[PDB]
UniProtKB/Swiss-Prot annotation, chain B:
Component of the NrfHA cytochrome c nitrite reductase complex composed of 4 NrfA catalytic subunits and 2 NrfH quinone-binding subunits. Interacts with NrfA homodimer. Residues 19-20, 43-78 are annotated as: Interaction with NrfA. Heme 4 binds at residues 56, 59-60. Belongs to the NapC/NirT/NrfH family. Heme 3 binds at residues 36, 39-40. The lineage of its organism: Bacteria, Pseudomonadati, Thermodesulfobacteriota, Desulfovibrionia, Desulfovibrionales. It comes from Nitratidesulfovibrio vulgaris (strain ATCC 29579 / DSM 644 / CCUG 34227 / NCIMB 8303 / VKM B-1760 / Hildenborough). This is Cytochrome c nitrite reductase subunit NrfH.
Swiss-Prot record, chain D:
It comes from Nitratidesulfovibrio vulgaris (strain ATCC 29579 / DSM 644 / CCUG 34227 / NCIMB 8303 / VKM B-1760 / Hildenborough) (Desulfovibrio vulgaris). Belongs to the cytochrome c-552 family. Disruption phenotype: Sensitive to nitrite, but not to nitrate. Loss of anaerobical respiration of nitrite, but the mutant is still able to utilize nitrite as a nitrogen source for growth. Transmembrane segments: none annotated. This is Cytochrome c nitrite reductase subunit NrfA. Component of the NrfHA cytochrome c nitrite reductase complex composed of 4 NrfA catalytic subunits and 2 NrfH quinone-binding subunits. NrfA homodimer interacts with NrfH.
Length: 494, 79, 495, 75, 50
């Protein structure tokens, strides 16, 4: 007799009513209300897992309760990012739908002048409005001031949305990132002919990576670039920053720096959210296990039919760990959670430790920079080697710190990297001492938290108060800012 | 298919020397995955689950005879 | 062609040997189990090397000489770190179970230049199924006899770690013959005769592949073997165990356990030994119930057409086809698998080497502070204690990983995490030895540590007799020059 | 108990155990009875509800619970 | 041809090793580790719904 399989499984083909350059989220809602409803789940902002969650608390704050701080924070962040915009505000990452709201609430962009002080390139991983802006300004876009687009964007309708990833006509997967396209091309891969399983990672690799901006002499001024030419590990990116850059400081010629730390005078690299580069050679990535496999797992929410979850959050919010439980159908959700925490707890604890020794390193170099006693004959050369190590240590811990998986994405790499960071920070302390003939030792004796206390409060507003810039010894390395009213409140002008 | 696999299995169990590893050949990976599709179409109608991984079992790993579970839950010595 | 259903039970085959209840001679099992025996004999292979491991018993501290003396992946500082302790005389890569007694009788760690070995009969505890008779014969009094007493009272080939150590001679049921493991099991409320199959497929190895210690005269039965597991299986637990169980009377270490005191730094030390079991239990395979047997004894059809468990206990990485792993990881290629192991191993070994460098620096810092002639800090004494304590903790921590034989593979995260902590401790020691000397020791701690404290490559019981050689390393001034004496024992022969 | 017995769910034979001890496939893919006695709203996929109400989404169900709770609490 | 439904659905019948007046939770753990692990989830004390 006949078959009863009268519906045959076929790969879905889509044809929308939308125009080829559509970017508005709300235009996608009528044709795909299911994925949209799922997309809207990103508005949830009250649930914490253990180390993560969607409460945008201050990541340097282990003091005040939620929503201001949390039991797992890094108290030393502001010290370590002295004189760099990250010392003003840096909070826990939350749902995609909040990208522009938070972008325009952050104190990192200046809101006490017309000019933001940062390039329009900050818009790069925030909005699919990036496509028109570039098509209109070309190479000239990047170097413009960030605040120049502040009021030319719909906060709800133009955040990271469907057009960031899908062709609005066919709904095929797209790479719309300029810098990612730049790498893909540099590798000989065609961004329109990419294997699916790669795409299910690369779509996120559009933004969840470590980046930098070209300086004036490195190519197109302020262009985003992924430092990936040497490979994906900390050593590889650090070696890339050895050869691509514009520093003119003796000892660091040709090297890149996001800023110089004003206490230690060390030329620093800044790392940001390197999920892609961490994931790619981690136990999961190495075996073809993909961001989408975990963060966009199939969920049977439409009757019993699969749709792709567009709720980008922690897999650990679902007590049944369903995203994991086809591949690990033999383990219980609780077993899996305990195996995640096995990595996370060690990593986070080691991070805090690696961060303390980095503060100590900066402090040692600061004392050696100012020392009035007898120096060694190789003082200058040793100060370089010292600063070189302050820079290397910080990069290594930043690499891990700034990474949102807290070890999980690449357990081995994460831990390895923190251990090396410790070695580097300490080698700096050793060198700073050698150079001062150990004369600084007496000033490095106690617990580091007494001699260099963690900086809990710092923003562009407080940096105006002369009384406040006296409360901590490291505040003397910063300038007192001029009295200014707030000029930008979100999108309106005061 | 039954007579070919049948014949080939009798031969392997008698005159041929099977290895320490028994693995599904290309052909059987194929007829199996097709039969995944045969019974679980409706769960998958709206989702390009066919294009992600080569076979369903690249996610549904344990449908492949519980390969992940400890040896002692699957196997003993011969008598 | 066939017609009854499979069984969910998974009934292990049942045996009834011709052997007596107390049979321990390996070659007695041969005629009844030729296929397992054949496999057991494959441990005799001693030429094949992997990346970090193998079966060549090279000197683990020798990255200078080629195989069989040394190897490109070795720990150059071993002898400095184990100064004044028997492990400074000889320490070789472990090899197959069939060699155990031969290698025991060849090691320079046991005194062969006197009648008395200077070490307890407990050393036999994990070398032979002769243990049972000997314990039955001398009870509590066995452990504290000298080791040399049984030296000639054993057959090197027929009484090595063979079948009787794991199998009941009559039924062939899996068995636990270890006294120290039985002690732990009993302390947990478990019945060693009534344990589930899966648990046993790990515990049988758990008989020997562990961290152990001997009771000192006031700790209970003298020289009796104990596993420090009451606090848990991790370094932190085991170290806490050793804070509370011990005999030290040294100020600031009262009640704590020590295996010896470092002659240079005067640090009461702990020795760690091969904690494969403690490492494997909460690592990603063990926590999932994948047992040593799954990997080191996977099923093989080699013989005839019938599957037996391989009794070739060696590196799973010897096999080009990784056949063992692929019973589970069937979607992965062999080379993929090798690459993921190396991922862990390269990192772990590199880090380990670093942690040992800093351990040596700590010892040197504390040594310097001990002999320091300038103005001491007001807290010199307390600081010097806190400093010694860290040298101690730091060493145990790396030792925990170094002694472990998988180079991090059994538990990647425990290994690397533990190594990182080792580092922090060792460094803390230095900082304190520096604090205590108001930094007047800095000047002696400046360069590369390999030019300050050069690796001790050579050292054995014979050489320690030569006073000229004993002037060869700064650190040799903390060891006595041994009395000129003739070799008494050569393997099993008296001279 | 006394609230539930004549409520829209109890009146129709819908039981505390039906909701607070729902079946969950946590042992391979086999059902065991949840002995986690808590809020059904902790599971973002509202799975306890989603056999009986398989045509509604978890979020739809949440909004219908809150429809009652918000009026009740305020009153 | 024959059925392939070789495992038939039956209502579980239990017989424990426990004495008739047993009240200790920890005595139930060895025979029912699954329900127990689920019972232990009640130790969670950080999650608020609305
Ligand atoms: C019942 C109808 C079945 C089914 C569905 C399968 N078998 Fe067997 N088989 C036997 C032996 C000795 C082997 C090893 C062969 C080798 O080394 O490659 C196999 C192999 C298989 C496979 C895997 C290889 C493949 O792609 O075919 C599969 C999927 C398989 N079998 C399924 C032995 C026997 C028998 C002895 C006569 C009998 C009867 C069966 N198998 C029955 C079945
Ligand atoms: C033979 C020596 C090997 C090798 C080289 C590897 N495996 Fe296994 N594996 C098994 C399980 C259950 C897990 C965890 C995932 C889960 O819970 O299902 C793993 C994990 C790994 C990894 C990744 C982890 C890491 O730290 O690197 C790797 C690289 C790995 N394995 C390699 C299951 C099994 C087995 C089932 C009983 C067997 C046998 C093996 N693995 C054997 C090996
Ligand atoms: C008659 C005896 C029944 C059959 C046959 C099935 N059920 Fe149920 N069921 C219930 C719940 C709360 C779940 C959730 C499972 C999960 O944790 O995901 C299930 C699950 C199933 C499934 C899986 C279906 C799916 O894909 O979602 C099947 C095929 C199934 N059950 C078959 C609840 C109940 C229930 C309430 C008290 C009863 C009486 C039954 N189920 C009975 C049957
Ligand atoms: C992520 C990669 C992935 C791929 C590829 C995949 N699945 Fe799934 N599958 C899942 C996930 C995740 C679920 C859980 C859905 C849920 O419960 O919300 C699931 C659920 C299912 C279920 C429901 C079973 C249950 O647990 O109740 C079936 C049936 C199924 N998939 C069939 C298939 C088939 C057939 C294929 C191949 C054509 C396939 N799947 C491919 C991940 C995958
Ligand atoms: C190449 C991609 C990329 C670039 C360029 C980029 N970001 Fe982001 N941004 C991200 C990602 C990914 C997240 C979420 C992950 C995280 O914050 O850890 C994020 C989060 C944020 C947040 C919210 C979290 C917080 O810090 O409170 C702000 C604000 C932000 N970015 C602003 C900026 C600013 C200002 C710049 C320029 C200096 C910038 N972005 C450049 C990718 C990027
Ligand atoms: C256009 C850039 C961009 C792309 C593409 C992108 N992200 Fe993000 N992601 C961000 C930014 C920016 C934030 C921070 C939003 C905020 O906090 O305001 C963020 C936040 C997140 C969060 C925080 C969620 C939470 O609730 O804590 C997760 C998880 C995440 N991204 C993962 C992903 C995944 C997975 C993908 C791929 C499917 C992806 N991102 C694609 C830029 C991007
Ligand atoms: C950061 C990337 C990203 C964003 C943003 C995103 N999606 Fe997707 N989308 C994906 C991925 C990955 C898939 C799975 C496709 C696959 O496996 O080939 C997918 C699948 C889909 C599908 C196919 C059906 C399915 O569920 O597999 C539709 C329709 C869809 N998304 C609509 C939308 C809509 C509408 C939005 C905006 C509200 C959106 N997507 C936002 C990455 C994204
Ligand atoms: C194998 C599963 C898996 C893969 C693959 C994976 N992730 Fe994760 N991700 C997790 C888990 C588990 C966590 C930790 C959740 C927690 O601790 O709350 C996490 C954490 C995160 C977070 C932090 C979530 C939060 O609450 O802020 C982000 C963002 C993220 N991953 C993005 C990515 C990106 C981008 C990729 C691809 C490069 C990726 N993930 C690949 C499972 C995965
Ligand atoms: C002859 C076989 C057969 C019979 C009879 C049958 N089912 Fe199913 N059932 C299946 C198969 C096959 C699937 C999976 C199809 C898919 O994945 O799309 C399924 C799926 C399901 C599902 C998940 C999908 C859904 O609609 O919820 C449930 C629940 C279920 N069955 C329960 C039942 C109940 C209740 C009945 C009685 C009315 C029943 N089944 C009758 C074979 C059967
Ligand atoms: C649900 C579907 C399914 C059923 C039913 C099933 N198997 Fe399998 N079988 C698989 C899958 C999946 C594989 C591995 C396919 C691959 O290598 O990609 C496999 C592989 C095998 C293999 C060798 C490959 C391996 O991984 O061991 C044998 C032998 C086999 N099947 C025989 C049987 C026999 C006999 C039965 C009946 C008792 C049976 N199968 C029932 C799905 C099934
Ligand atoms: C009676 C004690 C004892 C038991 C039981 C025991 N071991 Fe050993 N094992 C040893 C000793 C002692 C050596 C050192 C022998 C030598 O180096 O000459 C050794 C060596 C080894 C080696 C190195 C061999 C090589 O070829 O490099 C491996 C692997 C090993 N053991 C694993 C195991 C496994 C797996 C089990 C369980 C099935 C086990 N051991 C049970 C004591 C034991
Ligand atoms: C999941 C697989 C797996 C499990 C489980 C496992 N091992 Fe291994 N073992 C390995 C691998 C891989 C190596 C690395 C060998 C190499 O470097 O060549 C190794 C190394 C070793 C070695 C050193 C081998 C040599 O060449 O001398 C010993 C001894 C050992 N393991 C014993 C054990 C013991 C005891 C257990 C149980 C507590 C255990 N293993 C559990 C896979 C495993
Ligand atoms: C260090 C432990 C150890 C030693 C020594 C040992 N065995 Fe085994 N033996 C095992 C384990 C573990 C199994 C697997 C039992 C199981 O899976 O339940 C096993 C299995 C067996 C079996 C059952 C058949 C099989 O292959 O699974 C026999 C028979 C056997 N061994 C005989 C011997 C003989 C003969 C010797 C000595 C040459 C010996 N054993 C030495 C641990 C050991
Ligand atoms: C509040 C009352 C209550 C308590 C307390 C309770 N259970 Fe249950 N239990 C139930 C109910 C109701 C069922 C299923 C009803 C049925 O028979 O359909 C059940 C079912 C079970 C089953 C049958 C298997 C299953 O999953 O349905 C087992 C076994 C079980 N419980 C064990 C335990 C254990 C162990 C504990 C304590 C750790 C415990 N119960 C505590 C009410 C309870
Ligand atoms: C002339 C047809 C009658 C013979 C029936 C053979 C039965 C048979 C025997 C096998 O070993 C198999 C192995 C894999 C797949 C199918 C198999 N079938 O069908
Ligand atoms: Ca977050
Ligand atoms: Ca950067
Ligand atoms: Ca070896
Ligand atoms: Ca010991």
């Amino acid at each position: 007799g006949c078959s009863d399989v009268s519906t045959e499984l076929k790969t879905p083909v889509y044809k929308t009513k939308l125009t080829a350059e559509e970017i508005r989220n709300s235009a996608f809602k009528p044709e795909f209300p299911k994925q949209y409803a799922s997309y809207e789940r990103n508005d949830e902002t009250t649930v914490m897992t253990e180390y993560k969650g969607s409460v945008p608390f201050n990541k340097n704050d282990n003091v005040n309760p939620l929503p201001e701080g949390y039991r797992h924070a890094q108290p030393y962040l502001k010290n370590l990012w002295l004189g760099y915009p990250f010392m003003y505000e840096y909070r826990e990452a939350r749902g995609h739908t909040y990208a522009i709201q938070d972008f325009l609430h952050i104190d990192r962009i200046n809101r006490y002048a017309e000019k933001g002080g940062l390039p329009a390139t900050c818009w790069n991983c925030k909005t699919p409005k990036m496509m028109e802006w570039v098509k209109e300004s070309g190479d000239g876009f990047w170097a413009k001031d960030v605040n120049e687009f502040r009021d030319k964007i719909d906060m709800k309708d133009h955040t990271i949305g469907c057009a960031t990833c899908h062709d609005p006509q066919t709904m095929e997967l797209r790479i719309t990132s300029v810098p990612l396209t730049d790498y893909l091309v540099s590798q000989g891969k065609d961004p329109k002919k990419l294997p699916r399983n790669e795409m299910r990672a690369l779509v996120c690799g559009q933004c969840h990576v470590e980046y930098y901006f070209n300086g004036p002499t490195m190519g197109v001024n302020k262009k985003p670039v992924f430092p990936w030419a040497e490979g994906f590990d900390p050593a590889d990116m650090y070696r890339y920053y050895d050869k691509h850059g514009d520093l003119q400081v003796k000892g660091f010629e040709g090297k890149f720096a996001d800023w110089t730390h004003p206490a230690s005078k060390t030329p620093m690299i800044k790392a940001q959210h390197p999920e892609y580069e961490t994931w790619i050679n981690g136990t999961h990535g190495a075996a073809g296990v993909t961001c989408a496999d975990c963060h966009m797992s199939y969920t049977r929410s439409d009757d019993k039919k699969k749709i792709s979850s567009h709720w980008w959050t922690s897999p650990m919010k679902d007590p049944e760990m369903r995203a994991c439980r086809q591949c690990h159908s033999d383990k219980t959700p609780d077993y899996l959670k305990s195996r995640v925490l096995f990595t996370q707890k060690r990593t986070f604890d080691l991070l805090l430790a690696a961060q303390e020794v980095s503060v100590k390193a900066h402090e040692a170099v600061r004392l050696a920079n100012e020392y009035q006693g007898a120096k060694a004959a190789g003082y200058d050369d040793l100060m370089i080697q010292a600063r070189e190590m302050v820079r290397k240590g910080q990069f290594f811990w930043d690499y891990v710190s700034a990474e949102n998986s807290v070890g999980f994405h690449n357990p081995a790499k994460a831990l390895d990297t923190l251990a090396q960071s410790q070695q580097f920070s300490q080698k700096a302390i050793d060198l700073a001492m050698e150079a001062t003939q150990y004369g600084i030792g007496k000033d490095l004796s106690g617990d580091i938290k007494t001699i260099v206390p963690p900086i809990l409060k710092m923003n562009r507003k407080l940096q105006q108060d002369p009384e406040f810039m006296k409360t901590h010894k490291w505040f003397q390395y910063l300038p007192v800012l001029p009295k200014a009213d707030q000029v930008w409140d979100g999108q309106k002008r005061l | 298919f039954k007579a070919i696999a049948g014949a080939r299995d009798v031969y392997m169990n008698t005159l041929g020397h099977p290895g320490d590893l028994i693995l599904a050949g290309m052909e059987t990976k194929e007829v199996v995955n097709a039969n995944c599709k045969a019974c679980h179409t409706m769960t998958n109608v709206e989702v390009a689950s066919m294009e992600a991984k080569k076979y369903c079992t690249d996610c549904h790993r344990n449908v492949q005879h519980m390969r992940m579970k400890p040896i002692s839950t699957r196997e003993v010595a011969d008598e």
